[PDB]
Amino acid sequence: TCPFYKKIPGTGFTVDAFQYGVVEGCTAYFLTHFHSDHYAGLSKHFTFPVYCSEITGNLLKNKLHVQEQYIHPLPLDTECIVNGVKVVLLDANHCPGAVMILFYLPNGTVILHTGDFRADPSMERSLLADQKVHMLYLDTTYCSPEYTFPSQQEVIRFAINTAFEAVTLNPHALVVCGTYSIGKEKVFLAIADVLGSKVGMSQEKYKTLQCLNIPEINSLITTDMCSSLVHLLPMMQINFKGLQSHLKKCGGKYNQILAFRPTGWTHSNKFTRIADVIPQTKGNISIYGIPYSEHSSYLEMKRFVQWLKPQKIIPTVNVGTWKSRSTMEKYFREWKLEAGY
């Protein structure tokens, strides 16, 4: 049974609610982004209208085989009427194709559902600027002040400089980057660009990337592993055993691996600056954990909400424990008292 925080009151709509069977009263199912926790339940047999971004709709059709007649893609930043209700999709600054959804209820209530997002000051000059929001359904993944991490730009600077130094010292080193979902593509694309290489990967991952509308992508990626000095592997293979095994397969072309694991936050963020990050090393293999986040830091989240001044907040993440829920509610009240809304 569908939980309350996936329902939009006053509508026939649900958000990210595909694992509950047929939802009573639901006339349109929205999907914010193509991550498995959110699409869980969709397949080629789904027969209700799905509303999403163009990029999400490419992935639904090609990766999950959802039939075309049930996929309803909407442009961003454009007022659309769905089953008699005005909606807008906004870029979420998450993974490719990820959206926030603004709903203009028939009774005058306005609701913003963030999906998963990385709040940014640029959102303060979207179509959000123009009107009041009564209810915010908020991605609270990192809703506690211990959650700090650098900008995506600083993390990419570190990765580029690290890779370029290593391969210039040793032209026989291979770079490997871990992946398990869409998102974080800048990591491997920026490293391949500095090295003058295409990124090599499996057929299944190439197929996923070809759905994402990235400009000039055919210039940047390939399935011919032999031609590439940046390879993508499943995240689970990014360990000393899995990398050793991969290096065997490269036919003596390489004698060193430098590997990257983009994570979210890890506790080593509470002590170590990005500039100071060091790898784990065993012989001719080194692995860097880099804190590349596609969710809001605590401070980014707080700035967004204090700017928006919603009347009520409904968290969508960390909702299963009383301790988490009480922590989040305490920070929402601090923010409201400090800003005066």
User: 75-114 mask for Ni ion (x: CB under 5 A)?
Assistant: ----------------------------------------
Q: Measured from the CB of residue 158, what is the shortest distance to Ni ion in angstroms? A: 23
Asked if 205 is part of the footprint of Ni ion (rule: CB under 5 A), the reply reads: no
For 214, the 3-state DSSP assignment is coil
Q: Could you tell me which stretch among 9-17, 115-123, 255-263, 324-332 binds Ni ion (CB under 5 A)?
A: 115-123
Any residues with CB less than 8 A from the CB of 273 and at least 6 apart, and which? none
Site for Ni ion in 116-145 (CB under 5 A): 116
Q: Measured from the CB of residue 75, what is the shortest distance to Ni ion in angstroms? A: 21
Residue with smaller CB distance to Ni ion, 93 or 286? 93
Any residues with CB less than 8 A from the CB of 205 and at least 6 apart, and which? 179, 232
Any residues with CB less than 8 A from the CB of 325 and at least 6 apart, and which? 315, 318, 319
Asked if 35 is part of the footprint of Ni ion (rule: CB under 5 A), the reply reads: yes
Residue with smaller CB distance to Ni ion, 116 or 185? 116
Residue with smaller CB distance to Ni ion, 27 or 181? 181
Residue with smaller CB distance to Ni ion, 32 or 256? 32
Any residues with CB less than 8 A from the CB of 229 and at least 6 apart, and which? 167, 174, 175, 195, 197
Q: Measured from the CB of residue 137, what is the shortest distance to Ni ion in angstroms? A: 14
Q: Measured from the CB of residue 70, what is the shortest distance to Ni ion in angstroms? A: 22
CA 155 to chain centre: 16
Closest-CA residue to 50 (of 78, 73, 79): 73
Rounded Cα–Cα distance for residues 201 and 25 (Å): 43
Query: How many residues interact with Ni ion (rule CB under 5 A)?
Result: 2
Asked if 295 is part of the footprint of Ni ion (rule: CB under 5 A), the reply reads: no
Q: Could you tell me which stretch among 33-41, 155-163, 241-249, 326-334 binds Ni ion (CB under 5 A)?
A: 33-41
Contact 231/174 with Cβ under 8 angstroms? yes
Contact 188/155 with Cβ under 8 angstroms? no
Q: Measured from the CB of residue 33, what is the shortest distance to Ni ion in angstroms? A: 6
Rounded Cα–Cα distance for residues 233 and 199 (Å): 11
Residues forming contacts to Ni ion in the complex (CB under 5 A) are: 35, 116
